[PDB]
Amino acid sequence: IKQKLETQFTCLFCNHDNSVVCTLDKKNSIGLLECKKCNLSFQAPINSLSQPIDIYSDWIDACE
Amino acid sequence: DDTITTEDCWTVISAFFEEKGLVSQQLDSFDEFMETSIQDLV
Amino acid sequence: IKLYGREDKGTGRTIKATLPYVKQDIPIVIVFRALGVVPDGEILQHICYDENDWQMLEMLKPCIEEGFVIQDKEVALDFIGRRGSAALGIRREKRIQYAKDILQKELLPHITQEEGFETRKTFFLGYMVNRLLLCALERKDQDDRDH
Amino acid sequence: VSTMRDLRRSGAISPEVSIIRDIREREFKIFTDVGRVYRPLFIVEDDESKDNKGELRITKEHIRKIQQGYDDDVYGWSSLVTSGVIEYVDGEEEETIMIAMTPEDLQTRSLNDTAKRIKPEMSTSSHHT
Amino acid sequence: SFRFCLECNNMLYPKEDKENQRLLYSCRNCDYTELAEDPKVYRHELITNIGETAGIVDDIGQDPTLPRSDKECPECHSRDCVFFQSQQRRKDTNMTLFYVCLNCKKTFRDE
Amino acid sequence: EITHAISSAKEQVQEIIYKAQHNELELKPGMTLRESFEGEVSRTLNDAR
Amino acid sequence: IAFGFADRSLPHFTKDDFSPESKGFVENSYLRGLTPQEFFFHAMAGREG
Amino acid sequence: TPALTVYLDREIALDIEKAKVIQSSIEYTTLKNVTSATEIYYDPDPTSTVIEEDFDTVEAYFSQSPWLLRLELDRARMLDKQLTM
Amino acid sequence: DQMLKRIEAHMLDLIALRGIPGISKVYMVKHKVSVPDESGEYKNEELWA
Ligand SMILES: [Zn+2]
Ligand SMILES: [Zn+2]
Ligand SMILES: [Zn+2]
């Protein structure tokens, strides 16, 4: 099911707090991070135990 | 080895009280604290 | 450790352990692997000591299944520290180190606080979980608090 | 456990150290924590290797010495504790002992008074240790 | 007695050999796949009567807290034996005392 | 008289224990072995007193 | 009286006993005084009251 | 402590066996009460069985995915509720 | 495999053999009730309920 989450994670490119949305999409183990200012997209598979923070750490590692 | 009569028991208890006294635990704890604990805390 | 769920509710009897300075309860096998014992045979070696007591093995199996997403020390530790009640930005590099600290300290500190002794912590966790389930099996009366 | 209890009774171990054995659970716990609670008791000889079995470790000689206050080659309560006739027992260790209420219970009896008490039957144990 | 692989050390899952119409136990972290000797996949029982006699320890003859009975030990025929009741905490626990001897420690009933 | 009554009550309780131990003691409605046994003992002792 | 200790009420008894005295049956009347076990059990009852 | 006070009809109230019949009818008994043990046996053959426990039973009875579900029923309780399998 | 065990757990719970849902147990109780008699007099009457 589609899950909207205006979580307060900090973005790296636009560097705007609470501009990061960690949508949760469990149907096919797919994880999207939606940003509001620079509107970048991050993809990552999400397991049963995955959490917005898990996607955030994956994205942080990806950025560098 | 004769059986131990009740008076023997009361003798034992009297000696016990002689050695330790009624409030022994308070004094023992405080003396232990003063002697050692402060040093370790510091 | 909270023996979650009910009988024939929530699939199996999920078990999750609450750790110091963490923001969520954690599956037991996850912390086991993070602690050093990544393979499940060692885990079942430590937690169980009656192989014929199949019931405990099968009813702790559900926790085993859900911990297959982790296979090495590093990912387990990172998963742990990810809810390490710290701020945002520690990222994975220092996340596993933070987990290693929080497992070297703050956890069963009365046993020890330095590295190279997580074998003892594993053994103690196994014994403690074994006892918890023994009480869950009604093989011993629940502990008296007024004792 | 035998040797540890022997050593404590000899005084080599601090008397207030608790030695607990839970045979059923295949465990054996020792406690030297601070803040526990304990009380003294007599030590009844138990080993089935000497006539003294089922008899009090204390004897009239100990009482005489206590009354004197000095051993005939000071003799106070601590001497009794260390000499091996009285041992402190914490609450937990009480779980695993058989405590006779009075010395007379150590000796089996054979009366019929209406103005005194009658002991519990206590026939459910053909033998007592 | 659920068991692991001898090298992979991960749990083994019962997988069907539909191509050969058989049952086998499979592992996920390895390719080590072995044939299964038993079609049994799960054994969930409602009437719990397993281990009731499992509360047996060897040192049971050493504890003084236990009483000594006058009964005849079927194995050692000794008039010095102890006896205890079921250790299970089930509300429907029975009062059948498993008389335990000292040389055989065998759980028997005079009933 | 009182002592005889007390002894009789105690022996009745002993027989109750022996027979319930051997699972020869009947089960009261809605009450398990332990509960029915306890109720029987309580009734016996109150009656004796 | 429950088994506060391991399968017994007081250490002075033996494991796995259910006799009336072993679970709080005060036999002697007040005029005759009480044994220590009975006195303690009576104390338990009064405290609860 | 919820409870009901069920009064029976005139002629039943003076009868014990009809009362037992009505009791049996009312009692909310479920399979788990009568069920004793449950086992999942992969029976590869949809036509026969490799389980000797009911081999003769199934063979006498005889005269898709091979998955089979197997369970055990307690005769004692079933007879207690006087309901046949 | 998991589907089969889920269905088994569902069998163990949802299937009702007989009886009204919600009634855990039923007791066979005998009641005593006053009743006028043929002569108009009142007579007790043991009744089952
Ligand atoms: Zn952004
Ligand atoms: Zn494997
Ligand atoms: Zn024997």
XYZ file of C-alpha atoms in Angstrom, chain G residues 9-40:
32
model
C 5.536 -23.565 53.274
C 8.326 -23.443 55.870
C 11.828 -24.927 55.811
C 10.980 -26.944 58.910
C 8.853 -29.272 56.761
C 9.867 -31.605 53.957
C 9.396 -31.129 50.238
C 6.051 -32.252 48.814
C 3.892 -32.514 51.933
C 0.195 -31.626 52.075
C -0.783 -32.670 55.598
C -3.045 -30.238 57.476
C -0.278 -29.107 59.812
C 1.967 -28.668 56.773
C -0.381 -26.066 55.284
C -1.677 -24.101 58.246
C -3.916 -26.197 60.483
C -3.584 -24.799 64.006
C -4.585 -27.757 66.163
C -4.003 -26.567 69.728
C -6.501 -24.158 71.218
C -5.303 -20.792 72.474
C -5.483 -21.953 76.081
C -2.902 -24.596 75.170
C -0.675 -22.231 73.198
C 0.656 -22.584 69.668
C 3.779 -24.080 68.165
C 6.029 -21.719 66.180
C 4.759 -22.864 62.777
C 1.137 -22.462 63.819
C 1.847 -19.108 65.432
C 3.451 -17.823 62.245
